Amino acid sequence: TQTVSYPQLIDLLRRIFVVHGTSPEVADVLAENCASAQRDGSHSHGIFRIPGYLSSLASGWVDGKAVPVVEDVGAAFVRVDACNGFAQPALAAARSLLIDKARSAGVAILAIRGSHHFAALWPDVEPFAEQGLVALSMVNSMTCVVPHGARQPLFGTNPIAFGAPRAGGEPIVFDLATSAIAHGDVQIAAREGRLLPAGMGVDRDGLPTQEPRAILDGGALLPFGGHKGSALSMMVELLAAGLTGGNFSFEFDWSKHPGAQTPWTGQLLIVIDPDKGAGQHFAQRSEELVRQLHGVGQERLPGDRRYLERARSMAHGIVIAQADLERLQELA
Amino acid sequence: DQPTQTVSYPQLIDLLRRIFVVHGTSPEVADVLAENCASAQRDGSHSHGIFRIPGYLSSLASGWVDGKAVPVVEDVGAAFVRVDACNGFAQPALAAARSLLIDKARSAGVAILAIRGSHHFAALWPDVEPFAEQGLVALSMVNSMTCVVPHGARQPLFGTNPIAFGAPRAGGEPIVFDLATSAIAHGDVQIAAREGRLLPAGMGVDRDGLPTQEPRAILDGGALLPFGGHKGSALSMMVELLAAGLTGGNFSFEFDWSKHPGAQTPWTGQLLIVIDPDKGAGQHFAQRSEELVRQLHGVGQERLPGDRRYLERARSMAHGIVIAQADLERLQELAGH
């Protein structure tokens, strides 16, 4: 296993995206995102995703050269047509305007439509929290989750992410799928020949199963926390698709695009200046919550795992199997 | 068995209004709380219906909560409103800022209402429903008193911390959900303890951190578990940060009513986010949500979030609100009858 630096990995991935038809702008954005995921130990969202990115680009399913169109529609509202491109480039195109609105008006919404999101969600909220703002994001994906009480899948894994600043450390950030398990983890259990704990999914006949292969072979996933996670998943469909103008998780398919791996939906982001007109400092309040959490026994705070891995990567470099490095080099 | 009686929705509102006025609230506060409490009862939200009257009254009598507080509405940004509830209830504070909040939401596209120094002793869905009835999307969060053990922790810290959501649909009543981030709502634990029955397992623990189904064991030194596991705990933390951290109100563990015998209302805060889903849009949100409803029925989800309450609501308006004879007589006495 060879070791590559964070910036080295970025340049390598950027080359790959350029070679496969993305614009230089899109390549920069995706390379950094993917490399950041690897740096933080989010393997399921790191270099592991490259093949899926490229297979999706190959058919034109997702446009690696799309130019986001920003629409300033309100003192606290921004819409962006991702134009069948990735979501990250669209978010980047409107980020400055979004932050200006959030700081001026107190809160602002960014509604991205017609976008493909193939990464972790925490990278999208983290930057806002690093700048002292609170951010909430939702992205609906592709049909595979059975709504509570239903007999067939409808919702996507539909993740929700949240980021908030704290005076004494890195941002408090969490990113969770509303399904009981992430789709990527099901494939892993399948490859590793591992069974899943009860309640993660059902087979093609709608019967409970622990066999990841059964879930993948025409089966489906269940919502986390039963009716509660299901309600939250419905909210994600309504906010990331219904409000943005993008497709619901069931309003598109890959039947005409061999190799397509990305959902073609949308994304909602709500950015808030927690201290707008406040006689206190949110960051001090959150730091106190952290202190109290440690006090009752919670050793790890949401995000702690990634920050520790991040520190390791910046100090000793990112460790990657020579096999993967060579192929990435060949793709480059 | 306890013989029952029926009271119409308007009759119950009048009765509770009298109770609040007789016990020291301003007429504005009485109007707001009477309608809120009666609405919960009408919808079958038993944990937050008339069951809360005794607690409302003992909290008022102890001086813990100010029933005549006048909310101070603070216009702090084009899309941001804060309200100092002045140690009063949350609902009257929300009512005082409602018009301004809606104006900002429609004008700017989205707006936030940050209530601090408030007491919330009710269901959360009543707070988002009105916005959805008017074509807006609303999200709200409120924290309570400490009762939930964070994931991986040994002692309780978070409150029951519910999250509520309301959205309009072109062909029906608003889609609304109101879920506690605790495995079971704290209020339902109290109901179970009152009715002397056990709870389903896997929702709480006793003072020793051991599994229990006895509501009294949870209420007396015990604790509740976050729903769904680690994910529910993360959402509960978010509620503390949004309802208290951002508003200026106390976190669930930052208030003590030991000096106020009878105090039962959490003194914290509340966050509300109201959105015009169609701001600058080239489509209609209500049509999209109605399509989602159609698809949900198509895959087999017979009941949509909110349907349970709408069914009870219809039953209450048609046959009246069922109430234990003893409870009705108690309310009538409290009103002066």
Within chain B, all domains assigned CATH 1.10.1530.10 are found at 1-64+305-337
Domain(s) labelled CATH 3.30.60.50 in chain B stretch across 181-229
- Asked if B251 and A288 come within 8 Å (Cβ–Cβ), the reply is yes
Architecture of the domain spanning A62-177+227-301: 2-Layer Sandwich (3.30)
- Angstrom distance (rounded) from CA A288 to CA A278: 17
CB A113 within 8 A of CB A243: no
Domain with CATH 1.10.1530.10 in chain A: 1-61+302-332
Method: X-ray
Q: For the domain bounded by A1-61+302-332, which CATH number is listed? A: 1.10.1530.10
The CA distance from A291 to A168, in Å, is 10
Domain B181-229, classified CATH 3.10.20.30, yes or no: no
Question: Cβ contacts (< 8 Å) between A106 and chain B: which residues?
Answer: 76-80, 112
Instruction: Copy the structure tokens of residue B1.
Output: 């068995």
Q: What is the CATH number of domain A178-226?
A: 3.30.60.50
In contact, A134 and B137? CB cutoff 8 Å: no
Where in the sequence of chain B do the CATH 3.30.1370.60 domains occur?
65-180+230-304
Alpha-carbon distance of B151 to A293, in angstroms, equals 10
The Cα diameter of chain B in Å comes to 59
Chain B residues touching A206 at Cβ < 8 A: none
- Please give the torsion angle defined by the CA atoms of residues A231, A236, A242 and A246, in that order, rounded to the nearest 10 degrees: -150
The SS3 call for residue B163 is strand
Strands (E), chain B: 4-7, 72-77, 80-84, 110-119, 137-142, 163-169, 172-179, 204-205, 211-212, 223-224, 267-275, 321-324
Q: Are B57 and B37 in contact (CB under 8 A)?
A: no
User: Which residues in chain A are classed under CATH 3.30.60.50?
Assistant: 178-226
Residues 6+ apart with CB under 8 A from B308: B44
**Annotated catalytic residue, options B31, B39, B43, B47:** B47
Chain B CB contacts of A272 under 8 Å are 112, 246
- For A227, the enclosing helix (H) or strand (E) is helix A227-237
Resolution expressed in Å: 1.5
Residue ranges with strand state E in A168-279: 169-176, 201-202, 208-209, 220-221, 264-272
Please give the backbone phi and psi of residue A239, each rounded to the nearest 5 degrees, phi first: -85, -40
Residue whose tokens read 């730091």: A287
Quote the DSSP letter at residue B50. G
Q: Do B79 and A105 touch (CB under 8 A)?
A: yes
Cβ atoms of B174 and B133 closer than 8 Å: yes
- Identify all chain B residues contacting A182, using CB atoms and an 8 Å cutoff: none
* A185 counts as catalytic: yes
B290 half-sphere exposure, CB direction, 13 A CA radius? 11
Residue with tokens 């306890």: B2
Rounded Cα distance between A211 and A262, Å, is: 24
Task: Look at residue B176 and give its three-state secondary structure.
Answer: strand
The single-letter code of the amino acid at A158 is N
Annotated active-site residue in B84, B127, B188, B276: B188
Binding site annotation covers A121? yes
CB contact under 8 A, A300 and B238: no
- Look at domain B65-180+230-304 and name its CATH class: alpha beta
Residue A103, Cα to own-chain centre: how many angstroms?
24
Q: Give the residue from B299, B302, B307, B309 with the most A CB atoms within 10 Å of its CB, the best one to mutate.
A: B299
CA gap A274, B241 in Å, rounded: 10
Judge whether B82 is annotated as a binding position: no
**DSSP-assigned letter for residue B250:** P
To which residue do tokens 């398990």 refer? A181
Do the beta carbons of residue A85 and residue A76 sit within 8 Å?
no
> The domain B1-64+305-337 is classified under which CATH number: 3.30.930.10, 1.10.1530.10, 2.130.10.10, 1.10.10.2840?
1.10.1530.10
Q: Which structure tokens are listed for A11?
A: 């340049």
The verdict on whether A45 is a catalytic residue reads yes
| Chain B, nearest residue to A292 by Cα | B157
A:B CB pairs within 8 Å: 217
